[PDB]
Write a protein that binds this ligand. Structure first.
Ligand code: CUO
Ligand code: CUO
Ligand code: CUO
Lengths: 208, 69, 139, 208
């Protein structure tokens, strides 16, 4: 049903579809909609039930953890598809060193269109309606990866080590940690960001 | 509209095949050479209006005959 | 070799794709989007320039170039549908034969594709003309 | 004593934040002193010529033109002081090519330190109260930045020629033309923006 491509690989046409779809995603008020979809990851915590006693929905530090997030991505992908996205959500290959933050996400304004209208880039960010706060990202330049090999970045090393593990459990432990890095990188100190458990789901980078 | 034009395009293709039978080259058009060269908008107007690369390259009608393109 | 077949011949799955694809195409915010694509043929007129005082409609109608222009037009839609995940090429409705019943694909207002089990309007049945105020189904 | 105007880049964070808060505070000011009221003087609503038909109130195409605008900045400047703006109105030196837009004006969001929440920057934009609409700006000519075979730039050349003119009026014609370019680039196509005569006053960039 769907193919996933790298962000860099995405063509303008492909990205354009994504650009619009997210915009429409944002619009979707419904539960399927983005605002609702985000809450699945964390705050507000609906997880045990709507009841006051609540915990974060996502499973972390648990072997279930990769399962949950994997499922989570599909939810978005389906949402975009409904929205009319031509392609599966792209993944931002963190492992490779990043000369600069990907253009699709980075550009605050999505100028290109036949219309040549200027608009905000839904990809760039979103806001949290409950908090009525806005997403923010504090990123470290260090992310631009430098390494002796050059190829073997910390992420690459960490990911690879996890890769060599028959034990799933062992794999997950290593697997999750590598995953953690990006949240820290983008979020930075910002309370409302990827760095935060509850807030992080809001940023669109999350899906990528 | 799309469905209809598809049929009409289909018949046009039919004509081309008949021409081949005739021995006239199907791709080649003898007539209205001047018009064929000119590119057709908005196909010629690429992005942002026309994302499609193929139609853009194809905008010249001369190129259009070989549907296989 | 994308294949264009008679609309009647089309499979349910084939139909399925077209219905979903067009519907998604309708939604498509992009310039590639359906509403935008429609503007190519006629109003709003794009021809002199997308933004020009006097605009003319894109019709190389009444000219030799006419079949070529329309031929590209169809593919433009076809490519679009493919972006949507159209499995096949746009089908053709052969008017040449007499048809007691109008094609079901286009005719039916609601489509209850069995896979989803959900019922939605048939995007093929009509569209809405956004720029023209008439937010009516293309009648 | 007298306020000093520095370049935007020169502004310190402390200085910038004062400015940040002040104008944002200023925006709130409903008074005629308030920013919204201040905007009216430049253009719409017009009431330049009193009882007779109104026209935009700003002298353009006239030698008076630099006088009027100069007066205009001071008016706002005074407003900032009410705002308790620490320093004078910063100026964006268009003449020098700039790799990027100025952070203060450019950033649509201003991120405070200490994990301050990200909010829209006041400098980024303002709203048009009379005509319910938000001002917007699009820079079609991103290219203007850093275009130069050397120190000399198109603006520099234009300004320089104007500079070499003893006659005030001769200078004005040349000078005014240079002035207009920024409005064009910033405003772009957008109807409500620097590009438009009436609307331009609303943008804070006009100020800089
Ligand atoms: O883990 Cu729950 O967010 Cu990546
Ligand atoms: O529409 Cu212009 O031709 Cu069938
Ligand atoms: O002058 Cu009235 O606009 Cu700069």
């Amino acid at each position: 049903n769907k193919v996933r491509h790298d962000l860099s690989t995405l063509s303008e046409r492909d990205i354009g579809s994504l650009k619009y779809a997210l915009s429409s995603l944002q619009a979707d008020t419904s539960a399927d909609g983005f605002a609702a979809i985000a809450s699945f990851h964390g705050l507000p915590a609906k997880c045990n039930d709507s009841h006051n006693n609540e915990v974060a929905c996502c499973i972390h530090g648990m072997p279930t953890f990769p399962h949950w997030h994997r499922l989570y991505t599909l939810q978005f992908e389906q949402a975009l598809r409904r929205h009319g996205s031509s392609v599966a959500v792209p993944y931002w290959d963190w492992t490779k060193p990043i000369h600069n933050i990907p253009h699709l996400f980075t550009d605050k304004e999505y100028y290109d269109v036949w219309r040549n209208k200027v608009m905000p880039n839904p990809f760039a960010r979103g806001y949290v309606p409950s908090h009525d706060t806005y997403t923010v990202r504090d990123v470290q330049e260090g992310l631009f990866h430098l390494t002796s090999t050059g190829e073997h970045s910390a992420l690459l090393n960490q990911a690879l080590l996890a890769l060599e593990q028959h034990d799933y459990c062992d794999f997950a432990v290593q697997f999750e940690v590598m995953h953690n890095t990006i949240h820290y990188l983008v979020g930075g100190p910002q309370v409302y960001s990827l760095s935060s458990l509850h807030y992080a789901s809001y940023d669109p980078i999350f899906f990528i | 509209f799309y469905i209809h034009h598809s049929q009409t395009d289909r018949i046009w293709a039919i004509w081309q095949s008949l021409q081949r039978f005739r021995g006239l080259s199907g791709s080649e058009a003898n007539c209205a050479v001047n018009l064929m060269k000119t590119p057709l908008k908005p196909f010629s107007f690429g992005a942002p209006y026309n994302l499609n690369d193929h139609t853009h390259d194809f905008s010249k009608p001369e190129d259009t005959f070989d549907y296989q393109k | 070799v994308m294949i264009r077949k008679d609309i009647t011949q089309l499979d349910k799955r084939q139909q399925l794709s077209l219905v979903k694809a067009l519907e998604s195409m309708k939604a498509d915010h992009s310039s590639d989007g359906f509403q935008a694509i429609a503007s190519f043929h006629a109003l709003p007129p794009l021809c002199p320039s997308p933004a020009a005082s006097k605009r003319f409609a894109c019709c190389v109608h009444g000219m030799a170039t006419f079949p070529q222009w329309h031929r590209l037009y169809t593919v433009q839609f076809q490519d679009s549908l493919r972006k949507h995940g159209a499995v096949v090429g746009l089908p053709y409705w052969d008017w040449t034969l007499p048809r007691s019943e109008l094609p079901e694909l286009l005719t039916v207002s609601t489509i209850h594709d069995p896979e989803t089990g959900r019922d939605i309007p048939n995007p093929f049945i009509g569209s809405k003309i956004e720029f023209e105020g008439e937010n009516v189904h293309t009648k | 004593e007298n306020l000093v105007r520095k370049s935007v880049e020169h502004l310190t964070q402390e200085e910038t934040l004062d400015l940040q808060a002040a104008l944002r505070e200023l925006q709130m000011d409903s008074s005629s002193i308030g920013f919204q009221k201040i905007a009216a003087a430049h253009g719409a609503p017009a009431s330049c010529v009193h009882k007779d038909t109104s026209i935009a109130c700003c002298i353009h195409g006239m030698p008076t033109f630099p006088h009027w605008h100069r007066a205009y900045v001071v008016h706002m400047e005074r407003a900032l002081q009410t705002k308790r703006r620490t320093s004078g109105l910063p100026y964006w030196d268009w003449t020098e090519p700039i790799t990027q837009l100025p952070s203060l004006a450019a950033d649509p969001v201003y991120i405070d330190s200490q994990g301050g929440k990200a909010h829209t920057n006041y400098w980024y934009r303002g709203n048009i109260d009379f005509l319910d609409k938000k001002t917007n700006r699009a820079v079609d000519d991103r290219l203007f930045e850093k275009v130069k075979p050397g120190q000399h730039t198109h603006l520099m050349e234009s300004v320089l020629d104007a500079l070499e003119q003893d006659e005030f009026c001769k200078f004005e014609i040349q000078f005014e033309l240079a002035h207009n370019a920024i409005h064009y680039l910033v405003g772009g196509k957008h109807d409500y923006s620097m590009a438009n005569l009436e609307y331009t006053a609303y943008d804070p960039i006009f100020f800089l």
